[PDB]
Amino acid sequence: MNVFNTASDEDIKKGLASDVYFERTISAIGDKCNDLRVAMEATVSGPLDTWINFTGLDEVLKLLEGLDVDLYAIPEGTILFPRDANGLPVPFIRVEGRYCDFGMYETAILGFICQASGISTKASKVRLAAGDSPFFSFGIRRMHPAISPMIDRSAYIGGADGVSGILGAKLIDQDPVGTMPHALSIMLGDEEAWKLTLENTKNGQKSVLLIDTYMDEKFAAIKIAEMFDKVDYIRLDTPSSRRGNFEALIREVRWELALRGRSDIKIMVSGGLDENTVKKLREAGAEAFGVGTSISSAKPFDFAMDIVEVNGKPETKRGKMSGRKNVLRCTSCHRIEVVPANVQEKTCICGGSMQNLLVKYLSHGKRTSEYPRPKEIRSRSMKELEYFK
Amino acid sequence: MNVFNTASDEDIKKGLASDVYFERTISAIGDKCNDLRVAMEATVSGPLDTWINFTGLDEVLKLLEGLDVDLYAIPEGTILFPRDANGLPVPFIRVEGRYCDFGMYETAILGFICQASGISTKASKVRLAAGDSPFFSFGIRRMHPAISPMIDRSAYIGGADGVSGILGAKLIDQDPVGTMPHALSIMLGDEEAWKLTLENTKNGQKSVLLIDTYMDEKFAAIKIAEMFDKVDYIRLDTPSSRRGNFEALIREVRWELALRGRSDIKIMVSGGLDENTVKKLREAGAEAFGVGTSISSAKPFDFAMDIVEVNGKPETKRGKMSGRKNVLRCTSCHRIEVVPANVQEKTCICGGSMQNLLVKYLSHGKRTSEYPRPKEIRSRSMKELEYFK
Amino acid sequence: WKLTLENTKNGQKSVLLIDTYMDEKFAAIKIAEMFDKVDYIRLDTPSSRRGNFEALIREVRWELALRGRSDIKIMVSGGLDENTVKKLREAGAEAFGVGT
Amino acid sequence: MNVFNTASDEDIKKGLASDVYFERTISAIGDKCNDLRVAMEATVSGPLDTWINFTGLDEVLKLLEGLDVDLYAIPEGTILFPRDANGLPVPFIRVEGRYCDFGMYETAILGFICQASGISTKASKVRLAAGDSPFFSFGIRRMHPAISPMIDRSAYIGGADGVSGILGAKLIDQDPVGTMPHALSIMLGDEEAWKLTLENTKNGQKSVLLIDTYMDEKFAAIKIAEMFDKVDYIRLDTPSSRRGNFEALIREVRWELALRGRSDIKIMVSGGLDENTVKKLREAGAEAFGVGTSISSAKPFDFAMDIVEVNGKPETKRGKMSGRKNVLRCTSCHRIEVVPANVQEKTCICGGSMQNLLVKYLSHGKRTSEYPRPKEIRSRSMKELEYFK
């Protein structure tokens, strides 16, 4: 339909971004369509050995808005495990209405939550490792450009303090983050590149200088210390083959700077960073992190959507549990317990009462509240990430 | 800019889908821009323990067409390793021109080849395992819908005989593939669902019936054998928790059918399939495969783009090899050898002569040939996949 | 099933083997809404159908409670071990037939 | 019923050695009994990563003789894998008749083949490792005495040249094997014990002297060499805690004997022997082996018996393949292929023709041939063990 190999928002809204057997089956159903009301629930088949930071539901609402459907879901930014206290699959969203009215959208709805959720969950992990130190989403270049804005949104909501993509920055309503590339230094030499970068950085923003382009990080650090003065960060993006012991290198640089009484210069690292990498380099002395691929490429959660009830009667296939359900959670020990939809709360001297986490976002196609902006959502997940060490 | 969290083709064409430090650095360069001609080469830092089936270059050409740049690259569908006979990084594409003229596109260019390449490479692996048996791309639902068309294109070029997505089908100029979903059987019961599916399938296409919704695959298979007649395939999408030994189950079904002299009914499997899974189930008796997540979620190759020459002089950073280069390959023992761009061919009694694999696709922004359609490209990769067992 | 029930007397609990033809889940529903005095339901799931015996057992227990028949207890058997027993018990199995 | 916790032959013949639910179910069936003819086949669920040397069928015939049943089976001593060329379970015996007529015997029939088969299969393994060297079944003391005769029978049929048990010896029609115990040496001292043993050994039999009771095997070996003359074997049953390197010790002894030109004295080992142990000690110089626990305690094969057809119609449960079946094998490349009972032979240019391995041993309760004696059976398994390295 368009220039690149992508689906326009129109196309996806028309049911064009889907597996053909859906429209073909709806077509086969024909007249019976009018008489088939169902409730479908999305659950995680995917990785069960990890909690998840739910994200991407905003996209689902924009898609289903208008159809005569009811939509329940766990708010984005909520963190929990895929199975509850008793090993039951936790339903993340429930859709109700005439099957033929939205059935062709299964592909898109899953797509909206699988990939986004893996991203935000990976970012929350990095968030835990980075501690008080700032980290940024630097990985849109590893994924197809068309989805670069949602990648940065999920990395942000997941915990990133900032983002490098222009469009994602816009979406989360923050200024894009950026330092200087090796290119500048390869074209103009270090000195010229460093001077230019400093002359071009204004208040409100910190100075960052890339130093591993030509020299050894240690001598490049000395040269900068005794050449400039207003340099906030020094960034090391050490080539893989020079990374014998990145931690030892970072200690060496910090020592060499303090010796010259320039321990005011902070260190930022980037390049093939991970939560493990981040934790180690931080204990080594790195105070800022540029994290890309590990986050932008997070494996998606394997969400599945199934009809759990038909025309009021619980009905499913082998492997699924039938009936509409709610997701209750203790107001205290954040314990979960999936229950039949006719149960709204449950007591538990363990920690007060258990209240439903599901929330109605659409009623007959209409929104039931104003949707939170990214900042509000990541403010929620940071509070929720609290209960996870 | 648009409804969903995506970048429109306009946005990406405007340099909007990128890391801000690129435009910011180009901006800083200012007047010097006119005097900075560079050649940048994309190489695989990514997985080195595997060959790659290069895909996504078509998207790169549509992006760079118009800029006053020269573009060299390895044609899509070429299969090779990231390092050559002597462990040197193989350059997959080279761009030449004023740095400020395209420098902001680094993010998009990488995005176009990293993710697509992982997909097509994973599909070639499945292609090797499926043997003569047909397999289809069934995984767009795991990834964001906006990029569903490129996913199916790469799975196709990589070896898939067919694809389930509507838009991807259109792009590769083939009819979308589809069978029947559990939903149909959950709403109308098996019998009704099976009868409907058969009545709704026309010549040119084979009949496929999903059987694991309510019954045990074995008894559902008997019931179908002695109930219908014109049923080409039987599809098993056995729930994970019922998959004690999927291979043994498949043998059991095949035996039970032959006993009733209905070995004409073929078996198709789907659900969490892998190349290993595919190889085993095929040795077990499965004759068709629906492969999703393992392919749609393939890890991306970690491509990196660097300035390798400036205003005619070889120049790079630590970790990269400078100078423009060519990629020569033996016409026989498909051996590779990266060399300086002033070397077009090399002899080698090992197998004739070594000829350059790089091909000029853009000259001063103009195409230098008509771009191949998906069918032509996968016809190339199947020939190339020949030299790989 | 009818024969087994008619043939079981007081002092002893009723036990019905359910995995012979149907999927344990649907066989469990069918029994719940067909009988009433069935103490135990026994699953001797064939090895090749045992993808995740624990998950299957949870599925059955849920499907029964939904129909308010959580009074029906579950017994497992077939290639059981102390490890197997500990896991299936945490899964919801209340009786075990342990052989080999 | 008797002194010890055993089932008399009467008890087992009466259906007393069984799981109660069998008679209880037959009882429940009542009048329908007259109308329920079935065919049940025994298959190996058990270890599938190994071939099996089938044994114990003789016991099954003595149990079923008289009942109006037909019995097919693979002859004892046949060696093969549990699954055929295509991964299908191989049926080892088939019983046909009124279910109520023998159904209570399932427990006993399985018991007769599971444990015996593990024993004979383990012995064939030791047989392969022992090579040309003789080994004996020495393990009845680890198992309940009541079944000591069947243990030695299976170890013999499996490959043992001799057996230590009195009753088992009788059953295989051979003289029991025996050397001298530590007791004799603990009560009378070595010299007296050795002299007594020699004075008490007659022609036809070799002399064997236990030497590790008091001295170091090396010095005890010297002492014997220069004290006696007609000593055929020297037996080392070195205590576990003295077995630092049993192989090195054995080499040391052999050297010390040859030095004194007494390499005519052969060495026999015993104590915690295995096929691996046997292979190593044999390469070390041991020429005879006393093998116990590893054989007498062999894990049983997990045989299962199921109704595969009812009143002429193929019928089974999930997990089993229905219908009566035959087991065909190539007269050459000893390949197997289970097929429907209406197939007696199959061609295969691979190696002549495939002929049925199943053999009718009972017809209406009557034997259809004279049953082979143990010697004939192990003569068969040694020929069959040929095709296994």
Ligand SMILES: O=C(O)c1ccc[n+]([C@@H]2O[C@H](COP(=O)([O-])O)[C@@H](O)[C@H]2O)c1
């Ligand atoms: O400097 C920036 O603002 C910047 C923004 C986005 C990505 N990057 C670069 O891309 C690399 C990190 O991506 P990755 O996948 O190796 O983690 C690292 O070498 C950075 O120099 C750099």
Ligand SMILES: O=C(O)c1ccc[n+]([C@@H]2O[C@H](COP(=O)([O-])O)[C@@H](O)[C@H]2O)c1
């Ligand atoms: O039937 C189709 O045409 C079809 C097209 C695309 C995806 N699917 C389904 O999605 C599942 C396979 O995706 P996956 O990631 O588990 O490999 C499998 O259970 C199929 O039933 C099915």
Ligand SMILES: O=C(O)c1ccc[n+]([C@@H]2O[C@H](COP(=O)([O-])O)[C@@H](O)[C@H]2O)c1
């Ligand atoms: O139901 C009984 O009373 C019964 C008594 C003894 C043994 N069994 C069966 O034998 C199997 C268990 O033995 P095992 O070695 O697999 O643990 C299991 O499938 C049961 O159905 C069953």
Ligand SMILES: O=C(O)c1ccc[n+]([C@@H]2O[C@H](COP(=O)([O-])O)[C@@H](O)[C@H]2O)c1
């Ligand atoms: O000497 C015999 O005739 C003899 C007959 C049967 C068993 N044994 C002994 O029992 C031991 C071997 O049994 P095992 O289970 O350790 O292999 C070994 O120490 C022998 O001395 C010895």
